[PDB]
Amino acid sequence: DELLTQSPATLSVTPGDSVSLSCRASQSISNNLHWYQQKSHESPRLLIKYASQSISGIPSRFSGSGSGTDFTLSINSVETEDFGMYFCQQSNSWPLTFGGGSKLEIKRADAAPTVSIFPPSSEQLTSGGASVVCFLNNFYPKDINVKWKIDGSERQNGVLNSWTDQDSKDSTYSMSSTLTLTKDEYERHNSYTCEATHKTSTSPIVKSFNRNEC
């Protein structure tokens, strides 16, 4: 019932790079520190037991070290099959405690988002609701800023933002920004803008629709 703190929280690395994942115990645990790998839609799996014993069949690039309060899990030339979550667990005392984990992400070339803006569907309006949606697809890095503007003014109240995990197939990220509004609120105005600021650019990527083209 001691704290295991893992750093870094998130790491972006290119296959072939070397990495060190740290796990620090709030109290000396001897060598009672075990490491688990967890990949998307899989259960955790034992990589290393007692600070440095790799479990049989684990490949050689993986190795662990530490004692007392500082442990590190080193991966030599990272393979693509290595990206996922890593966790440390202590068996020193009761209760058994776990670290928050460290996420390993595949660093790839920088990519600007492809943004799509959609007005509310008529079926939604008939229910008297209006969701304006903006898809900001396949970008890298993960940091992106989205801003809504209704008739040129910024609007923060009401936005739900959702991000995917690294695409399995291309390493990019996708995000959906939804501006939820009452039916009547929606009809009080004409222009809805979705503006994305991404590292790939100096100026904002922007898409707009007015109550105009039917």
Binding site: P95, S176, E213
Partner: protein, 216 residues
Amino acid sequence: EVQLVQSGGGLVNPGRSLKLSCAASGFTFSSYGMSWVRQTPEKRLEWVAAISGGGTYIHYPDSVKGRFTISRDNAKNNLYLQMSSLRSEDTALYYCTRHAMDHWGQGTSVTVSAAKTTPPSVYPLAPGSAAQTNSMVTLGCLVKGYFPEPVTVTWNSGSLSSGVHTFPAVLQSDLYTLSSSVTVPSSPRPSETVTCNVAHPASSTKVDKKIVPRDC
């Protein structure tokens, strides 16, 4: 060889009880200590309880002491978790393991909530069929106000898998909202059918929503 297959999770009200079961396979059950370990939705692992091969010597963290009971059946090779006086904080994927755990089972999801099962409202998002340009039109589907998880969204009955992005669910006070998007060449634009299909296992709902780069 070693297999651990968990079962019994489901939606239960705050204060109810539930019985999880773990079927061991491929080892001498008896000689092994077993533990329950849960993963919260924020993906943190919490150890819940441990039982010795002989089932004498039990340990529990304070959070669960007196609510949960770990038990094993050395004859039938079953590990059991009796949960009671359940709280919203016990909502997680509950795993197994054999003793640190060297083998994990698949997980059983347990959701503790007061919300009642509610099917989705599926809404087609057809581009402002002007506000586009190329041989690459992105259509969408909004899947609002359902409970609980999950939902399965397909683009044209699985066919269209290239393009598609399904964004995780966001809990907007006891209803989830989900969106899915698809990218096809402006053939089909009305050129053909594009249909988003959603199934809500928990509500026995199958819904087909025909987009097609339509509407005004």
